[PDB]
Amino acid sequence: SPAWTQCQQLSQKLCTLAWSVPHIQCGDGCDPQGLRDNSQFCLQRIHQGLIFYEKLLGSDIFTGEPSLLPDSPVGQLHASLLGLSQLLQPQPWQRLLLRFKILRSLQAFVAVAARVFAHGAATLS
């Protein structure tokens, strides 16, 4: 249903923006068979994960020293995450280590969601 082809594009733009906490786990039904049987369940868990990443991307986490540069691709993540969210259902001293763990976690998350959209575009559409 959710126009898998457009989800594939928005998720691919997310992967590329990122290569520069919620998790999709077994019980989420985001495996290939789980997509076939209950795609609504999996895409619900993806959506909530994106919403959560949107909030982190605009917090006291990505503000403060060392300051984020305007040219940075990290500054465009909030955009691409929000588009995909509609497509489905319309920190004191070392912030540095926590920003890193969040970005590496988001690469892992977007990799799984892309497999979901690729597989549903090839089997569910």
Binding site: P66, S67, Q94, L96
Partner: peptide
């Protein structure tokens, strides 16, 4: 703390102001 390049790389640390 620009020595982060030795912990996360020169690409990641180039995202921030030093």
């Amino acid at each position: 703390r620009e020595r982060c390049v030795r912990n996360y790389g020169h690409e990641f640390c180039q995202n921030w102001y030093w």
